[PDB]
Structure 1
């Protein structure tokens, strides 16, 4: 019961033009567009009920404070967290991982320990860890890759030992579209007493996610890629763990009491990790996005997308010299290169045709180096994308071939 027509109707940005031609936005993987329900949801808040949160004595203040917490609660349901107090608000996935890397990392990883990451990880789930290791004096281990864009799981036994503190894996790759066997991996990581942090910035909007079912200890995703506003993300941490974690950022709202002579005492999670004035407007907008996606049902969306993907792939076969990267059972994104032509030019011609695509390393250099490629193209397929747009890509891609030879 899904209708691309009814959906695309909510995104005003889609009826725009570029270079005089209709815009074919195939870069939702970099950041998704927002429906007018999400846009107005925030705007209205600013126009009719804006006030400082932090539970104030006056009305608007107390009302805003409540709306904010309802969003936290609603989001806990979305990923199916056990309780709303297991969710911390962050700017995005990047900040989320940095919070963990510091708060939890600095106090659980001693010199001599090792952390495991995959080779397909986005820079946000790499650098924060390299830094932790730099100062704590720990070892960083990487799960190699197979040619088809899948993790070489057979190497797991020789990476997971007694001194393995944490496993930071991506739920779904942002380039290959690969979806990793989280469940299984988490189990194995737990049998060694290691914690697991899943980076689901790419998973949250392609199908349902149950943090309880997975039993991951940390989960993060960004709102701007979930058809929502920028500057707001969600960090989920198991209550058991969160309570033990020390504050990262310090300031107002996250303290219980501040004394220049007695010292300062912190408040309790999650508020302990939310210092200063919130991104109230972004949160309100995130709620709108959450509610909107639920209205269509992740399963219905998951279906229309998987269908449009099969179409897209088969169609891309008629393009000569096209080289794809990743598994056949890919999700959301398509990584490719045209013959020996620099991705920068292929994307440049495509833009001229009114088609949006990303070209570069996609903040995933280690993965580019695995393929000896300096960069590739990445077309993204989202719920608001149509078959016609797929053809438009295929065609212009063949055109670029016949032209540049």
Structure 2
């Protein structure tokens, strides 16, 4: 089993007060709070180990380079990659997806080809493909949704054909909490020679993720939602593909040699897509965030969060005129609207009770359009949230409905 009380004690922010009331942070899906072990790992690095990592000569630099490469190894085991050199450090999920669309997309998607996304994609997994499709004259196809917030799988035969170069799909919806059948969809994609990029930003923190078993070709996720620092994410790429990807945004440790008369050359795999100075502080902290989550056990985390969610959905039945979006087996997030009140207002009232939720379009406008609403509220129920916080949310919605109804 798994003790919320012992976990919560690790997170100094949860003692905080907002509007003079105790904080109920229900917005982890936007960005997670960080445990002490993560915060101090970063700070200790700065206080006693800090140096440049440009594979440099003196001791501090050599030790920092080893620290950073150990984190790359730890992250590869975390998602069960075959090799640490299949992992690239990126600024975040957004930049990783763009990296793939520029380096791989421009070399492998020609005029008259098509790319497939879904209608529940976060904008980070839409805009790069929309632009790749314009550059090269390709077509962007969209898997549509069902009312319950799952993908209309029956439509895949009309979307996959011999010219489909890539499926880009979310692992878990940041709005609905739907978990897509990645394994099976990847089998279909690979029958046509198409590659699959998986947007995993909302998945790696709710349960184990095994990129070999999935057999996905690209997998990207974000540090700051994995209880880690800002400014760091992970892009996984199959070795065979990665060693074929040409260069793009060239800098320092991405640039091998440069000549005014003969041009420049670029360094080998992972490192070639890591220009300039790496975010060594961020990397150190992501490392610790991986160790912390592993020490708790993603299966323990999955079990506690899953029961918190069942509890929450049961308690929410007693909220009048509540509209929920998504499936019964959602992970992590609950999306709703209250009667006819703008989500902006509902969120403002909950914040007034010290409850933080996200309101707006959640960086998923096509998904809002599908449901014919302009916005929704979203509450995240993460590993450090409690039955009491769910009770405050339920009570709060009841009060807002009595007051504004």
TM-score bin (small chain) = over 0.9
5 Å matches for 1:9-24?
A: 9-24=9-24
* Shift in Å, 1:265: 1.5
Inter-partner Cα distance in structure 2 for 1:225 and 1:397: 26
Following superposition, the deviation at residue 120 of structure 1 comes to: 0.2
Q: Displacement, 1:256?
A: 2.6
What residue is the counterpart of 2:52 in the other structure?
52
CA-CA distance at 1:333 after TM superposition:
0.2
Instruction: Give CA-to-partner distance per residue, 1:227-278, whole Å, 9 cap, x none.
Output: 0000000000000000000112112211232122122111100011111100
Question: TM-score with structure 2 length normalisation?
Answer: 1.00
* CA distance in structure 2 between the aligned counterparts of 1:305 and 1:2, rounded to whole angstroms: 10
CA distance in 2, matches of 1:143, 1:211: 23
1:256-302 deviation line (CA, Å, top 9, x unaligned): 32122122111100011111100000000000000000000000000
DSSP 3-state at the match of 1:219: strand
- Larger deviation, residues 214-223 vs 242-251: 242-251
TM value normalised by structure 1: 1.00
Q: Distance in 2 between matches of 1:56 and 1:132?
A: 37
Q: Partner of 2:102: helix, strand, or coil? A: helix
1:141-182: CA deviation from partner (whole Å, max 9, x where unpaired): 000100000000000001000000000000000000000000
The equivalences for 1:5-404 within 5 A come to 5-404=5-404
What does the per-residue CA deviation read over 1:198-231, in whole Å, with 9 as the maximum and x for residues that have no partner? Answer: 0000000000000000000000000000000000
Q: Which runs of 5+ in 2 are unaligned?
A: none
CA distance in 1, matches of 2:308, 2:127: 34
Question: Once the two structures are superposed, what CA deviation does each residue of 1:124-149 show, in whole Å capped at 9, x if it has no partner?
Answer: 00001101011111000000100000
Q: Distance in 2 between matches of 1:69 and 1:247?
A: 21
Mean Cα displacement is larger for which, 373-382 or 251-260?
Answer: 251-260
SS where residue 140 of structure 2 aligns?
A: strand
Cα distance between partner residues in 1 of 2:47 and 2:381: 34
Distance across 2 between alignment mates of 1:9 and 1:252? 41
Structure 2 Cα separation of the partners of residues 251 and 308 of structure 1: 46
SS of 1:104's equivalent in the other structure is helix
Instruction: Supply the distance in 1 between the matched residues of 2:20 and 2:256 (Cα, whole angstroms).
Output: 58
For 1:318, what is the secondary structure of its paired residue? coil
Distance apart, 1:363 and its partner CA: 0.2
SS at match of 2:359: strand
Q: Partners of 1:201 and 1:148 in 2: how far apart?
A: 22
Structure 1 runs of 4+ off > 2 angstroms? Answer: none
Q: Cα distance, 1:364 vs. partner?
A: 0.1
How many residue pairs get aligned? The number is 405
SS at match of 1:209: coil
Provide the C-alpha distance between the structure 1 equivalents of 2:181 and 2:251, rounded to a whole number of angstroms. Answer: 39
The superposition leaves residues 327-364 of structure 1 with CA deviations (integer Å, 9 ceiling, x where unpaired) of 00100000000000000000000000000000000000
Shift of 1:55: 1.6
Q: How big is each residue's C-alpha offset from its partner over 1:76-125, in whole Å with a ceiling of 9 and x where there is no partner?
A: 00000010000000000000000000000001000100000000000000
Q: How far apart in 1 are the matches of 2:64 and 2:46?
A: 11
Q: Distance in 1 between matches of 2:342 and 2:312?
A: 22
Alpha-carbon separation, structure 2, partners of 1:203 and 1:48: 34
